[PDB]
Amino acid sequence: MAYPMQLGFQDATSPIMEELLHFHDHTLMIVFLISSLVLYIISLMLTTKLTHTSTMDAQEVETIWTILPAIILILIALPSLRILYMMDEINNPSLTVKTMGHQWYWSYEYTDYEDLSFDSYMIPTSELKPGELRLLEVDNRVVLPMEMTIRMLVSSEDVLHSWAVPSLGLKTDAIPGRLNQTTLMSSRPGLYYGQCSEICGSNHSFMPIVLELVPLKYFEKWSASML
Amino acid sequence: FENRVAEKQKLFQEDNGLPVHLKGGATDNILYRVTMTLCLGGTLYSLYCLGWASFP
Amino acid sequence: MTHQTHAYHMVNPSPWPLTGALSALLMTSGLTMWFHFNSMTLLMIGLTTNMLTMYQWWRDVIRESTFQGHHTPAVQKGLRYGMILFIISEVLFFTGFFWAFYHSSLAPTPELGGCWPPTGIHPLNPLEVPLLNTSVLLASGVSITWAHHSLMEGDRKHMLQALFITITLGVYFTLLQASEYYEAPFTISDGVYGSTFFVATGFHGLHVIIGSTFLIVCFFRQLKFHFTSNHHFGFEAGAWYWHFVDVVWLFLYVSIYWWGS
Amino acid sequence: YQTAPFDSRFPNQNQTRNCWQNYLDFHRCEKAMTAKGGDVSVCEWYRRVYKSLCPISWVSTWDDRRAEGTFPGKI
Amino acid sequence: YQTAPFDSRFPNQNQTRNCWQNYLDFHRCEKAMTAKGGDVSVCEWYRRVYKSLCPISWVSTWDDRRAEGTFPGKI
Amino acid sequence: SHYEEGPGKNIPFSVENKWRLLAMMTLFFGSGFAAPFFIVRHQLLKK
Amino acid sequence: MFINRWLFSTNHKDIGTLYLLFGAWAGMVGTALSLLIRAELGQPGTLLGDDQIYNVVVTAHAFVMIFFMVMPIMIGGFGNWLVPLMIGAPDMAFPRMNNMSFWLLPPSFLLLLASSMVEAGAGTGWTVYPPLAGNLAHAGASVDLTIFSLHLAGVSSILGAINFITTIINMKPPAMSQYQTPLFVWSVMITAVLLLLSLPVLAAGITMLLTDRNLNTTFFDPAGGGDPILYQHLFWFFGHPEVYILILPGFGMISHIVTYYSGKKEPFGYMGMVWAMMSIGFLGFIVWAHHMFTVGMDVDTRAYFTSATMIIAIPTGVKVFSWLATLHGGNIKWSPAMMWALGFIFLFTVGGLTGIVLANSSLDIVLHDTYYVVAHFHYVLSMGAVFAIMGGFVHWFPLFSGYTLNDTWAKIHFAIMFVGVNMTFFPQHFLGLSGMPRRYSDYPDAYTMWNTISSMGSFISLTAVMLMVFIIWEAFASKREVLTVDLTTTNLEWLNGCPPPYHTFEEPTYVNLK
Amino acid sequence: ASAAKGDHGGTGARTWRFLTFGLALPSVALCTLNSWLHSGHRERPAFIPYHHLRIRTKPFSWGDGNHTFFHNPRVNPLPTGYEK
Amino acid sequence: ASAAKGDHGGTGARTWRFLTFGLALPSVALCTLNSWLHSGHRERPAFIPYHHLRIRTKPFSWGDGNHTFFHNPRVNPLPTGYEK
Ligand code: HEA
Ligand code: HEA
Ligand SMILES: [Cu+2]
Ligand SMILES: [Cu+2]
Ligand SMILES: [Cu+2]
Ligand SMILES: [Mg+2]
């Protein structure tokens, strides 16, 4: 989750999200370089009484400023693409959960063995118990086993919705009639919050996501007591 | 057939200080006013419908 | 100054743009009434003022060119560009529909039966009337060309004869296509196959009618000796539009009628 | 069996067909083992997979379609 | 069983695929009933058909190909 | 062309009296800025 | 008389004035809408209500500013006013059609206003994506009216695109090559081409959406075998070219402004500058899908689109560096317009740099649909497109009117707006990195600080657009007539005095064929 | 499936008029006959209430709002089933 | 997948020379890089004596009559199997 007065990304709960933080730092370092370079050149140009309004030869310097940006783009592209494939990588999940966006709530389905399925709704700010997060708490958290490769399958039963969980570096739209897949893999226990990342009507802002990650043992007992 | 473009060229080149859409006579004028009338009325009618549909 | 020394045309203030803009308002909002509060009176008025505008706007253009002689060479070269460009925007309009079609037929969703044509759809036979419509359109392509050549050679009777043959083939296709619609064992409402089919072939259909009234206009302008063996842009355009129309049908035939069925 | 494993013929973010294919496959196999007996052998694998990946609502509606005979797939 | 009946998916003078398809089908079914047991059920139909329509020499060579593992079809 | 030319004459509104102008500009831009507010109001008063 | 002049026009100058008037007024509506947006987000809680009334507001904000302020002003206003004057043409190729282009706009705007009145308006987002835009989740006339408004606005823009390309190509002096026309003219000739090819695909898309909800078609309905994603492709195929269509005329004005106030004859690297816009225009057609990174597409294609999108930085770079090279040996004049030009150069750089970040699909997964992307486009739109409009407006106002603006006031106006927009959009980078989604009427408690600061900045901007209205009034109230203009040898638009007569270039311009 | 044929190097109106009556029109006649011979009237397709067909999410703006525009009762069933 | 772009109505040699160095050549450079980056050396494919491959009905008119013209031993096996 996000804390007050935050500047950058939420702390990485999973390895690709870590990988992203580092890539962003790399990319951001460059935007700082260029954006400060331009500002320096500008102030430089505007700070002299010396003139040279006659004709100036282009092209010559034109190569420097066309080949340089080209090299820099590779320096970003390479890391970017690697992480890109790393995400769509050949992994073998040990669990498959489904989530279905609905107009103003998500419903989850764990059906590998038994037909377990529940509804996850936001807790009205009015009925929050002290210490509970205003627009983020849901009544039924989606419980999953920490330290395990889970396969999420996102879809919707009405309009478009988007299932996202920033700490894990996930976001997948929920398109009716479609089964989009994503690999979840938290490397640490806890409660991880997310929100609908797609305009879906009146309560678009009020249909959050809360992941609760406990060890396998507790996961399975939870699963059973759930039916 | 005919071929009297020569008569019309003359009619339309006549320096009567009239705009091309009227240079051709009285019918041009009635057509104009009919068109203009229907458009404005229609536009008025449309505004009425929208004011009407705005409400539950 | 006072008297111009450039070969361009300074068109007199016309109320038509205002009139046609108002028309668009009336037709659009009128469709909204028809679709929602079940009324066409507004849609009727709009279609009316619209025809009125087009008639007059084009009547004047004829006046300014044929009767008043404002269409100097420079002015004409500009009209050629305009037409080309317009036809282009049209080519890209139809491209949205072929995109749609190919998107659907190349990756059929399971709700269709995971196949194409979807289960339950009985496609028409390309070798029957679709094949006929194809040959009709193609023939009018050769006949409109004959017309063009007679015109440049000052052969009044023949240009008229060819323009006439061309026009009837265009009508023949319209009727034939109309019957196909009526006999078709599927409708706009039959899922994506029907949507894809009726709106693409449908918009094209509308274009054949728009192209035929254009050639008709050309026919009468010729009966009235408007065209000279050398200055007949109105015809050149009508001709270019007419070809755009065969070509679109060739893609429709091959894509929707043959490949996607 | 843990969960449906990775399927090379369905290597991308979109698994719609994965769910679809196995649902067909199962019911197609089922119908055959029925109309053949062959000791009423059974194609469970396909059902395990399709149950894991296909959201309930799809399976349900498909079953109903198969009931009233308006199911568009060929089994 | 008299002989392989008319097959709508193979309605023309050329039956090459008819022979081919059923030969595959049989061996594909066979492999499955084996690696599943399912009371070692058996897909005889396909073998009756492919034996009727496929000339001996083709079946023979295909079997050999399947033996040395140089059989081009996917079973 | 009887179309007058020059500063203050190539526009569809009179610029001869600065205060009549003030009024006009005020209604013009003013009505434009107020419209969204009254639309929201209108939507809030429906049922 | 008034009718004949103002309703029945065939004059590029008068039609152009009519546009600027339409654009300014629409600019008021859009500003009001942007304030309701920040009013709603300036304190934790709900001011207006549910995401419907809120998103109706967000949607109108986008349509109004994009289709009714920016496009009319830059292309219809400056386009019609300056193009003929810069190439020495008596007027445009199709004077009458040109008028229809303009008159199609007010009706189009009416339909959009009407949409938010009937029923509950259109709370679909400017992308009006289905199923939300469909006849189930959005039953009623609203979306349909939004669609028809877009049809007219599109018919208006491709008719004008046809006019500009024909004029610009066909009506220059016989001895003048295309490589002899000014960057602004090139800028609109290229923008005109993008409109001609992208607008029709949009109309194809929304017409399909219109039939899906009134004629029982299922282009985007899974039930019939449709695909909600298909709409995304069609929309975005137009949707991207659309943003370049929005910045290109701005690039041109900037080239003119920077050169003029640097006391230079011509801009540095003129042919490089022509090459740059042409490249930008072209690459802009093959990158639409970067707006669909989290939709479920193949990794490979997702890789193509991030690369294709990134190469646009090269040509854009040659332009930024060229404007800098233009300032080089210049005799700089710190005029209001030059202030707007410098701001643009920097701010636009930052906003486009921030767009290169989003170009990465991997990183975009966590950045998509957040306020980071709201920051990106407001930098390139609020301090890019808009800064060009202001610089061009203050620079050419005397030409259009014959009167001058109070430079000091004009400078005060820059100062205020410069502070306002940065304070408004800077914080938003954080809200987005930290996860605040787009299109929310309320947010978790943590996002309160930045949203507060952000909303305060929008009030400063309000102050600036109010002051501007006054600044225009005063100019017209005082009446200081223009006397002398510098550098006319290289700036044709000014050769006929301020304001140029109803009929300019009645007798052509003499240009030798060396 | 052809390749091409009889070249007549000089094309004027006589050539196009020749192609019109010597090629274009004769084809329209053949195909007309062909289509007049293959005029086999297909027996109206079996009705089965498939959900991906006979779509209806909003009644049509005309008639009883359940009848498609060029509705042919002989070959087009309503959602419920064939007309009569 | 494009549509088109920047029109420059007048085409002379300057225009074609402009397209050559401003479009044509830059593309050859990009693709060159692309192909220089995707230069992934595939490991020689698994040999399996399929009968429809490595056909030999008449020894080639050169060498040992069993070696195809542009024979690359690394990726091309003889009928018997890979060269060495
Ligand atoms: C005029 C407006 C404008 C302009 C010009 C641009 C320009 C760019 N934009 Fe865009 N963008 C928008 C307006 C604009 N954009 C809008 C409206 C949206 C949101 C729409 C919606 O979804 O609602 C959006 C959304 C958007 C997205 C998707 C975000 C999401 O996930 O939802 C992406 C991603 O690729 C993107 C990227 C870019 C890029 C790469 C550029 C490039 O053109 C930037 C080029 C500029 C530079 C690169 C800086 C100058 C060059 C140099 C100094 C050279 C050296 C630098 C380097 C080597 C990097 N934009
Ligand atoms: C032209 C483009 C444009 C401009 C300039 C702006 C300007 C503003 N916009 Fe933006 N905005 C969009 C286009 C624009 N916007 C779009 C496309 C979206 C996406 C909608 C969606 O999500 O569907 C969006 C979304 C959007 C959001 C996100 C809402 C959400 O997703 O929840 C916010 C919130 O702060 C916002 C605020 C503002 C603000 C504070 C201004 C302020 O900076 C305004 C300052 C005022 C001005 C700069 C106008 C003054 C200029 C004139 C009036 C011209 C005067 C005329 C003459 C001189 C002749 N806008
Ligand atoms: Cu949602
Ligand atoms: Cu939502
Ligand atoms: Cu884009
Ligand atoms: Mg999205």
Nearest CA to CA, how far is B31 from chain C (Å)? 8
Q: In the numeric block, which tokens belong to residue G229? A: 């994603």
The token pair at G361 is: 């699909």
CB G220 within 8 A of CB G230: yes
The structure tokens listed for F15 are 């610029």
Q: Using a 6 Å cutoff on CB, does residue G355 contact ligand 1?
A: yes
Q: Minimal Cα distance from D15: which residue of A?
A: A179
Contacts of H49 in chain D (CB under 8 A): 68, 70
State which H helix or E strand residue G358 sits in.
helix G336-359
What stretches of G370-447 show up as alpha helix (H) in DSSP?
371-380, 386-401, 407-425, 428-433
Long-range own/partner contacts, residues C38-43 (CB < 8 A, 24 or more apart): C38/H61, C41/B45, C42/B42, C42/B45, C42/B46, C42/B49
SS3 call for A122: strand
Cα separation of A194 and A135, whole Å?
10
Cα(D14)–Cα(G294) distance, integer angstroms: 11
Tell me how far apart the alpha carbons of residues G265 and G330 are, in angstroms, rounded to a whole number.
10
> Which chain C residue has the Cα nearest residue H53?
C190
* Rounded Cα gap, residues G198 and G154, in angstroms: 10
Closest Cα to residue G185, out of G88, G118, G55?
A: G88
User: If you measure from the C-alpha of residue G144 to the centroid of ligand 1, how many angstroms do you get, rounded to a whole number?
Assistant: 30
Looking at residue F38, its amino acid is F
Amino acid code (one letter) for G24: A
At A54, which amino acid appears? S
> Looking at beta carbons, which residues of chain E come within 8 Å of I50?
70, 72
Domain around F9: 1-47
Q: Which residues lie below 8 Å from residue A220, measured CB to CB, with a gap of 6+?
A: none
- Do the strands A150-156 and A170-174 form a parallel or antiparallel pair, or are they unpaired? unpaired
Which DSSP string corresponds to chain C? --S--SS---PPP-SHHHHHHHHHHHHHHHHHHHHHS---HHHHHHHHHHHHHHHHHHHHHHIIIIIS----HHHHHHHHHHHHHHHHHHHHHHHHHHHHHHHHHHS--GGGTSSSSPTT--PPPTTTHHHHHHHHHHHHHHHHHHHHHHHHTT-HHHHHHHHHHHHHHHHHHHHHHHHHHHH-S--TTSHHHHHHHHHHHHHHHHHHHHHHHHHHHHHHHHHTT---SS--HHHHHHHHHHHHHHHHHHHHIIIIIIIT-
Q: Is H15 helix (H, G, I), strand (E, B) or coil?
A: helix
d(CA A97, CA A85): 22
* Number of structural domains chain F divides into: 1
Q: What CATH architecture does domain E1-75 belong to?
A: Orthogonal Bundle (1.10)
CA nearest to G60, candidates G108, G114, G126, G106: G126
SS3 G274: helix
G219 vs C5, C28, C195: nearest CB: C195
Output b/e per residue, A94-122; b: 16+ Cβ within 10 A.
ebbbbbbbbbbbbbbbbbbeeebbbebbb
> G1-514: CATH homologous superfamily?
Cytochrome c oxidase-like, subunit I domain (1.20.210.10)
The shortest CB-CB distance from I6 to any of G177, G281, G286 is to: G281
**Rounded to whole angstroms, how far apart are CA atoms G434 and A6?**
6
Ligand 2 atom closest to the Cα of residue G454 is 35
- Closest by Cα among A94, G213, B26, A166 to C188: G213
Backbone φ and ψ of F8, nearest 5°: 75, -5
Instruction: Report yes or no: F6 and G402 within 8 Å, Cβ to Cβ.
Output: yes
Structural domain boundaries of chain I?
1-84
Contact E50, E7 (CB under 8 A): no
Shared domain for C114 and C207, answered yes or no, is yes
Q: Which two tokens stand for residue A195?
A: 């929100």
Active site residues of G: 61, 91, 126, 156-157, 240, 242, 244, 255, 290-291, 316, 319, 438
A171 sits in which H/E element: strand A170-174
Domain range enclosing C8 = 1-70
Please name which of G419, G378, G95 lies closest in space to residue G246, comparing C-alpha atoms. Answer: G378
* Residue extents of the structural domains in chain G: 1-514
- Please work out whether the CB of residue G375 comes within 6 Å of at least one atom of ligand 2: no
User: What CATH number has the domain bearing residue C43?
Assistant: 1.10.287.70
Contact G174, H19 (CB under 8 A): no
Residues paired with A152 in a beta bridge: A97, A182
Question: For ligand 5, a single-atom ion, which residues have Cβ within 5 Å?
Answer: G 240
Residue B50 with chain F: CB contacts under 8 Å: none
Pick from G203, G231, G192, G367: which is nearest to G293 by CA? G367
Identity (one letter) of the amino acid at C121?
I
Chains in touch with I (3+ beta-carbon pairs under 8 Å) read E, G
CA dist., res. G68 & res. G77, Å (int): 12
The tally of domains found in chain C comes to: 2
In order, the DSSP letters of C198-249 are HHHHHHHHHHHHHHHHHHHHHHHHHHTT---SS--HHHHHHHHHHHHHHHHH
Please check whether residue G212 is in contact with residue G134, taking contact to mean a CB–CB distance below 8 angstroms.
yes
Residues of B in contact with C29 (CB under 8 A): 46, 49-50
Residues, CB-to-ion distance under 5 Å, ligand 4:
A 196, 200, 204
Is G507 annotated in a binding site? The answer is no
| CA E25 – CA D3 distance, rounded (Å) | 28
Q: CB atoms < 10 A from the CB of G493, how many?
A: 22
Closest Cα to atom 58 of ligand 1: A69
Q: Answer yes or no: is the C-beta of G312 below 6 A from any ligand 1 atom.
A: yes
Question: Could you tell me the two tokens for G465?
Answer: 């657009």
* DSSP of C175-211: HHHHHHHHH-S--TTSHHHHHHHHHHHHHHHHHHHHH
What sign for the dihedral angle of Cα C172, C174, C177, C178? Answer: negative
Query: Resolution in A for the shown PDB structure?
Result: 2.8
Classify A92-227 by CATH class: mainly beta
Cβ of residue G236 lying under 6 Å from some atom of ligand 2: no
**Ligand 2 near G382 CB (within 6 A):** yes
Q: Which residues pair with A153 in a beta bridge?
A: A98, A181
Q: Is G360 in the pocket of ligand 1 (CB under 6 A)?
A: no
Q: What is the DSSP string of G166-233?
A: HHHHHSS-TT--GGGS-HHHHHHHHHHHHHHHHHHHHHHHHHHHHHHTTS---TT-GGGT--HHHHHH
| Method of determination used here | X-ray
Nearest ligand to the CA of G191 is: 1
Give the integer Cα–Cα distance in Å for D50 and D23. 5
Classified by CATH at the fold level, domain A1-91 comes out as Helix Hairpins (1.10.287)
CA-based nearest residue in chain G for residue F1: G502
| Residue G342 · residue A42 · CB < 8 Å | yes
Residue type, G168: I
Residue with tokens 């190509």, as numbered in its chain: G169
Is G96 exposed, middle or buried, given 0-12, 13-18 or 19+ CB atoms closer than 10 A? buried
d(CA I9, CA I24): 19
Task: Give CA–CA dist H66/H59, Å, rounded.
Answer: 6
Contact between A96 and G307 (Cβ < 8 Å): no
Please state whether at least 3 CB pairs lie below 8 Å between chains F and I: no
Helix (H, G, I), strand (E, B) or coil at A56: coil
CB D4 within 8 A of CB D48: yes
Tokens 């109320």 map to which residue?
C15
Residue F20: Cβ within 10 Å count: 12
Determine the 3-state secondary structure of A210 from DSSP.
strand
Instruction: Determine C/D contact with 3+ CB pairs under 8 A as the test.
Output: yes
Six token digits for residue C240: 């270019």
Residue G210 has which token pair? Answer: 């219109």
Terminal Cα distance for chain D, rounded: 26
Please name the residue of chain I whose CA is at the shortest distance from the CA of residue G273: I22
In order of A213, C43, G64, G72, G115, the CA distances from G106 in angstroms are 56, 19, 12, 11, 14
In CATH terms, the superfamily for domain H1-84 is Cytochrome c oxidase, subunit VIa (4.10.95.10)
Beta strand pairing call for A161-165 and A170-174? antiparallel
Instruction: State the Cα–Cα distance between residues C225 and C128, nearest whole angstrom.
Output: 41
Are the beta carbons of H57 and G216 separated by less than 8 Å? yes
What domains appear along chain B, each with residue ranges and CATH number? 1-56 (4.10.91.10)
Gap between the Cα atoms of G185 and G164, Å rounded: 9
Provide the pairing of β-strand A116-120 with A105-110: antiparallel
Other C-beta atoms within 10 Å of G176: how many?
15
